[PDB]
Design a protein around this nucleic acid. Structure first.
Lengths: 55, 351, 218, 65, 100, 65
RNA sequence: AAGCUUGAGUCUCGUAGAGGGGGGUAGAAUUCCAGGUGUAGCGGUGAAAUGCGUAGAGAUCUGGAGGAAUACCGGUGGCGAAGGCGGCCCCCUGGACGAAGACUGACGCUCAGGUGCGAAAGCGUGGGGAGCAAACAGGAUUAGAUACCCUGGUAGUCCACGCCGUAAACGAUGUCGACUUGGAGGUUGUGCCCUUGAGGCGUGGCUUCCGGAGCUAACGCGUUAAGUCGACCGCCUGGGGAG
RNA sequence: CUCCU
C-alpha cells in the first residue's frame, strides 16, 4: 500500500496519448492545471502522428 | 446645465486616444503592479516591467506621469494597453527627426547580426537592422572593442514592419505583406518580435508589418511536451525569433525559438566534449540502469549501470551511489545526433 | 459636474436596455452616463440617508469589485456603520437566523484566542483555530457589530452583487446602488447612474455618503 | 507532393503538405457517397464551431484556480 | 449590340496562317455592320498542360462587338478547323482594351 | 486580413495570371477566403476567373500533368 | 357618385445569385481493350476464405474507347412557392432587391371546389450502361444467420417522352398585415463626410446564433415569436381496430 | 499534430 505512480505528470502524458489515439479530436478533455494540461496536449499531438502512421 | 455638455466636449478636447498625453499619475505601487489614472474609466493594472529602466529597478514613485495607450475598451473590467509602447512613438519621433533632421545622432552600439544586420539598441530598447546598416563600409565591428560606442547612422528601415539597421563608427561619414514575402525568407533569418497571445499550443510572436508567426510548443526551449509556453517565456515581449518556414499559400510563417540554448547543449557536447573531461554533477533520478546526473544547463540522460564500479551487472546503482549527490563523472562520449551524452564513473582509482 | 472623481460613462455594447434614460454613445463606442441627471438622483439618495440615519438606522455597505474592496472598509469605518467587502455570503440577510451563530463563532472565538487557549492545545490547533479566524474575519468582520437586520443597503455594483439586492428585496429593506451601464436598475430603489469600477468614483460616491451619515447623525 | 531541394531536405516539408491534403481527401473519398450527411456533418461541425467559440468566450470569466 | 471576348488558341506550327485567319474573321465580322475593340495576339506561349500531346500554343484575343448570328457562324468556323484548338467566346457588357 | 480586390476598384479579369497565381496554391487548388481574406463577391469572381484561366490553359488544374 | 395616396401595381438605371429549359466543351479519376517492361503473388478482413494470377495477374508506361459526377472555390453562403438547384461557355427565359423620380388610384388579402408544380423508389416506350448497387450466387460469422462483413453481380441509378402523386414532403410551426426592449455575426445594395487609411455615421432586403419582457404543461420561442391583435382557409376531439 | 486575439 504505497504512493501514486508518476504523480499525474507523465500519467497526464499517457492519458493524452491514449485519448489522442482513440479519436477524441476535441483536445477538450484535459486537466486544468498547466503542468498537466501541457502534456495531456503533448501526448495528444504525439498521438496524432501515431494515428497517421497506422490505420 | 449645458455646463456639463460643454464640460464634456471640453474633456473630449483635452484627451486623445493613443498613449500621447502623459496624464496618469501613479497612485499606488506594489510589486508587481503599478497603477495610474489618465482620466479614463478605470485604473490600469500596469506590470512593473514596463517601468524599470535598463538595469532592473524602478524609476517612478507616486505622482509620476507617463501616458499609456488606448483604442481597446473593456475586457470585463479595467482600462488600457501599456504605456511602454507609448515610448515607441517617442522613439519613432526621434528616428523621424534623424530622417527629418536628415540624420539622427544618439549612440548606437552593434555587436552582431541575428539576421544579417547588426543589432542596435537605443536607451532601454534594442532594435535589429539589416546587415549593411551596422557598418558604413566593409569595416565590420567584430574587430572593434566589443559592444562599442559610436551612435547609429541609418542604413535601412522597412517603414511598415519595424526593422531599422543603423551605421556604427566612422563619424566622418555623412495584399501588402504577402506578394513579396521573400525578405526575411531564405532559411533562418532571425527577427526581433513581440509576442501577443499564447494559445496553450503556441505563443504568437508576430511583428513584421501585418503577419502571423507561431513558435507553437515543440521548440520554445529544450524540453518538448511538459513545457506550457506561459511558464517559459512571457506575455508581450520582444524575443529571439526567426522564420524556419514560410508557406506562400495558407499564409503560415512557422517561426522557431529553440535556435538558442540549442547552442548551449552543443557547447556541453563540445566544451566538455573535447575528449574525456571530468565533471562534477548531481544525480536526479536513478532508473535501475543508471543514475542520471544532469548538472551543467539541461544536458539530459547520462551514466549507464555498466561502469559504476569495477563490477558489471550486480550493482543496482541505488545501492552504490546516492540520491541527489555530486560525483566524479567524466564524459566518455557525446553523440551529436539523437542528443545522448554518455558519462561514466568507473574512471577512478581502484584498478 | 465631474467634481473630483471621473464618473463619466461605461462599458461598450452590452448595456442593459432598461438604462436608455442614461446614455450618450461616444466616438470610441463607449456610453456616457448623463452626468447632468446623475446629480439629482444622488442628492435624492443622500436626502434619504440623512433621514434613515438620523432615525439611528444601520446602513450596510456592499461592494467587492477587487478595487473597491478597501474603500468600503476605510470609507465606512469612519462612520459608525457596517460593511461587507470581501465575499458576499448567500443569505446573510434573509438567512441571518443561521448566519447569527456563525457571528457567535467569530466573536466567541476571538474572545478565546486573544487571551485564552490560543496556545494551550497544539501548534496545529493554533494553525486551525487561527486560520478559522482569518477565514471568518474577512467574511463577517464588518457585519460583526451589527447584531440585527439593517435598515439600508448601499450597493456599489448591482451587476456584481445582484443577489444581495434580491436578498434584501425578499425582505423589506430599501436598497440603493450606484449602477453601471450594464447593471439592472430594477430592485434598486434609489438608482445612481455612474461609475462602479473607478477607485476615484468609489472614493467619491462612498465618501459623500460617508459625509451624509456621520454629518447626518445629529 | 513535390520536394527536390538541397542536401538538408526530403522528409519534414513533404510529410507536412503530403500528410495534410492527402490524408484529408483520400480518407474522405475512400467510401460512403452519403449524399445526405455532408449536410448533417457540416451542420453539426459548424454548430459545434459557434458553440465552442461562444462557450470559450463566456467561459473566459473565472475557474477558481 | 452583344459584346464578345473571343480568345482562341492556335496549333503552333500552323501559326503563319494566323494573320490570314484574323483578316478573314474580322473581315467576316466587319461585313455585317460590326465594330471591333481589340486585336491582341499574345504569340506562341507555353501551355500549362498538354493539349493533344502538344505544348506551346499561339493565342489570339479578339474582343469584338457583333450580332448573335454572326458570332454563331464564327463559332462554327472555329469548330470546323483543325488549326483551331480551344476557342472561347465570352460575355457581353462594354468591351475593353489592353490586358496583359 | 485585407481584401486586395477591395483595396483596388477592380472587377476580376481572368487574364492577369500574375494576380491569379497569388490565389492558386502550388497544387493548383483555389485558396480559401478565410486564408486570403477576400470579400465574398471577389471570391466568386476569383473562382470563375481561375476556372476560366484553367480552361484556356493559363493555369494548371493539378501538378500531375 | 366624386375623389386622395400610405396599401397594391407600372416605368427609367443598375445589383448579386448552384432560379429554370435547350446546346456545347474541359480536366482529374474509375472501368475495359490493344501493346511494352517485369514475375509471384494480388485482393480482402476483427481474423479468414470465396475470387483473380505462371494461359503472365497486381504494379509501371504509351495509346484508344465509353459512361457518369463535377475536387479545390464552399462559405449554420446564394437562388427558388415548395420539391430542389454546384466544372466552364453560349442561346432563350422567370423572380427578388435598392436609389431617385414619374404614373394608375384600393386595382387588396385569403380561398372550399378546381387547376398546376411536386425528392427518391417504381411503371411504359426507345436508347445508353463507366462506377455503384436491391434481387441472386458464393465465402465467412453464428447454436442457427434467408443479416451486418467479404468476393462477384442483374434491375435501377443516366437521357428523351408519358405515368405515378407519395416522403421524418419538417421550421414536425398555413398565408397576409400591423405593433412590441437588445447584442454578436453573415450576405447583398445605397447615402453623406477628411476615399484623404481595409475610415466614420446612417440607411433598405434576405439570413444565423444568443438572450429581454411577454408566453408556454415544461422544453423552449423570443421583432424572421410559440408575445399583443386582425382577415381568411385547412385540421383535432381517448388508445387499439385503422388511415 | 500549429494559426489565435
Amino acid at each position: 500500500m504505497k504512493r501514486q505512480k508518476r504523480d499525474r505528470l507523465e500519467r497526464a502524458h499517457q492519458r493524452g496519448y491514449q485519448a489522442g489515439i482513440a479519436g477524441r479530436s476535441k483536445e477538450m478533455c484535459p486537466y486544468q492545471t498547466l503542468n498537466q494540461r501541457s502534456q495531456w496536449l503533448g501526448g495528444w499531438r504525439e498521438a496524432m502522428a501515431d494515428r497517421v502512421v497506422m490505420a | 446645465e449645458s455646463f456639463a455638455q460643454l464640460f464634456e466636449e471640453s474633456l473630449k478636447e483635452i484627451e486623445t486616444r493613443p498613449g500621447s498625453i502623459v496624464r496618469g499619475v501613479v497612485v499606488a505601487i506594489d510589486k508587481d503592479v503599478v497603477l495610474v489614472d489618465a482620466g479614463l474609466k478605470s485604473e490600469s493594472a500596469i506590470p512593473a516591467e514596463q517601468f524599470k529602466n535598463a538595469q532592473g529597478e524602478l524609476e517612478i514613485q507616486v505622482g509620476d506621469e507617463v501616458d499609456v495607450a488606448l483604442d481597446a475598451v473593456e475586457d470585463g473590467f479595467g482600462e488600457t494597453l501599456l504605456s511602454r509602447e507609448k515610448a515607441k512613438r517617442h522613439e519613432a519621433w526621434i528616428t523621424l527627426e534623424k530622417a527629418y533632421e536628415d540624420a539622427e545622432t544618439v549612440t548606437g552600439v552593434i555587436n552582431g547580426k541575428v539576421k544579417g544586420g547588426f543589432t542596435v539598441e537605443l536607451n532601454g530598447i534594442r532594435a535589429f537592422l539589416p546587415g549593411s546598416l551596422v557598418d558604413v563600409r566593409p569595416v565590420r565591428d567584430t574587430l572593434h572593442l566589443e559592444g562599442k560606442e559610436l551612435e547609429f547612422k541609418v542604413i535601412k528601415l522597412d517603414q511598415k514592419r519595424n526593422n531599422v539597421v543603423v551605421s556604427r563608427r566612422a563619424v566622418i561619414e555623412s495584399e501588402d505583406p504577402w506578394v513579396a514575402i521573400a525578405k526575411r525568407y531564405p532559411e533562418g533569418t532571425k527577427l526581433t518580435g513581440r509576442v501577443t497571445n499564447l494559445t496553450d499550443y503556441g505563443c504568437f510572436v508576430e511583428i513584421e508589418e501585418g503577419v502571423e508567426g507561431l513558435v507553437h510548443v515543440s521548440e520554445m526551449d529544450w524540453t518538448n511536451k511538459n513545457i506550457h509556453p506561459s511558464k517559459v517565456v512571457n506575455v508581450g515581449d520582444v524575443v529571439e525569433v526567426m522564420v524556419l518556414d514560410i508557406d506562400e499559400e495558407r499564409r503560415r510563417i512557422s517561426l522557431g525559438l529553440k535556435q538558442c540554448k540549442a547552442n548551449p547543449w552543443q557547447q556541453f557536447a563540445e566544451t566538455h566534449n573535447k575528449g574525456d573531461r571530468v565533471e562534477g554533477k548531481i544525480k536526479s533520478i536513478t532508473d535501475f540502469g543508471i543514475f542520471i546526473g544532469l548538472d551543467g544547463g539541461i544536458d539530459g540522460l547520462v551514466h549507464l549501470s555498466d561502469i559504476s564500479w569495477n563490477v558489471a551487472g550486480e550493482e543496482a546503482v541505488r545501492e552504490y551511489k546516492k540520491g541527489d549527490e555530486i560525483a566524479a563523472v567524466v564524459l566518455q562520449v557525446d553523440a551529436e545526433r539523437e542528443r545522448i551524452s554518455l558519462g561514466v564513473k568507473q574512471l577512478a582509482e581502484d584498478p | 459636474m465631474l467634481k473630483a472623481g471621473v464618473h463619466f460613462g461605461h462599458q461598450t455594447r452590452y448595456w442593459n436596455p432598461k438604462m436608455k434614460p442614461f446614455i450618450f454613445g461616444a466616438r470610441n463606442k463607449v456610453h456616457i452616463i448623463n452626468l447632468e441627471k446623475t446629480v439629482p438622483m444622488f442628492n435624492e439618495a443622500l436626502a434619504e440617508l440623512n433621514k434613515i440615519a438620523s432615525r439611528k438606522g444601520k446602513i450596510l455597505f456592499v461592494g467587492t469589485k477587487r478595487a473597491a474592496s478597501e474603500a468600503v472598509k476605510d470609507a465606512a469605518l469612519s462612520c459608525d456603520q457596517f460593511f461587507v467587502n470581501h465575499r458576499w455570503l448567500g443569505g446573510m440577510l434573509t438567512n441571518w437566523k443561521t448566519v447569527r451563530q456563525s457571528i457567535k463563532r467569530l466573536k466567541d472565538l476571538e474572545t478565546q484566542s486573544q487571551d485564552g487557549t490560543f496556545d494551550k492545545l497544539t501548534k496545529k490547533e493554533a494553525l486551525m483555530r487561527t486560520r478559522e479566524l482569518e477565514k471568518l474575519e474577512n467574511s463577517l468582520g464588518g457585519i460583526k457589530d451589527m447584531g440585527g437586520l439593517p435598515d439600508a443597503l448601499f450597493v456599489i455594483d448591482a451587476d456584481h452583487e445582484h443577489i444581495a439586492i434580491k436578498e434584501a428585496n425578499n425582505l423589506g429593506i430599501p436598497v440603493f446602488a450606484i449602477v453601471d451601464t450594464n447593471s439592472d436598475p430594477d430592485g434598486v430603489d434609489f438608482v445612481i447612474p455612474g461609475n462602479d469600477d473607478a477607485i476615484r468614483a468609489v472614493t467619491l460616491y462612498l465618501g459623500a455618503v460617508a459625509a451624509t451619515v456621520r454629518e447626518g447623525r445629529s | 507532393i513535390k520536394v527536390r531541394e538541397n542536401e538538408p531536405f526530403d522528409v519534414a516539408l513533404r510529410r507536412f503538405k503530403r500528410s495534410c491534403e492527402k490524408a484529408g481527401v483520400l480518407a474522405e473519398v475512400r467510401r460512403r457517397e452519403f449524399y445526405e450527411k455532408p449536410t448533417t456533418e457540416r451542420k453539426r461541425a459548424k454548430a459545434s464551431a459557434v458553440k465552442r467559440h461562444a462557450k470559450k468566450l463566456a467561459r473566459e470569466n473565472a475557474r477558481r484556480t | 449590340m452583344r459584346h464578345y471576348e473571343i480568345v482562341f488558341m492556335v496549333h503552333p506550327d500552323q501559326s503563319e496562317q494566323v494573320p490570314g485567319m484574323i483578316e478573314r474573321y474580322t473581315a467576316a465580322i466587319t461585313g455585317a455592320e460590326g465594330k471591333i475593340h481589340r486585336l491582341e495576339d499574345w504569340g506562341r506561349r507555353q501551355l500549362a498542360y498538354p493539349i493533344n500531346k502538344l505544348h506551346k500554343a499561339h493565342y489570339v484575343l479578339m474582343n469584338v462587338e457583333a450580332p448573335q448570328e454572326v458570332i454563331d457562324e464564327l463559332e462554327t468556323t472555329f469548330r470546323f478547323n483543325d488549326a483551331v484548338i480551344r476557342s472561347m467566346v465570352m460575355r457581353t457588357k462594354h468591351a475593353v482594351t489592353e490586358a496583359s | 486580413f485585407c481584401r486586395f480586390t477591395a483595396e483596388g476598384v477592380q472587377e476580376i479579369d481572368y487574364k492577369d495570371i500574375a494576380t491569379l497565381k497569388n490565389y492558386i496554391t502550388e497544387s493548383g487548388k483555389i485558396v480559401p477566403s478565410r486564408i486570403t481574406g477576400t470579400r465574398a463577391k471577389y471570391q466568386r469572381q476569383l473562382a470563375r476567373a481561375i476556372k476560366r484561366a484553367r480552361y484556356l490553359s493559363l493555369l494548371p488544374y493539378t501538378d500531375r500533368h
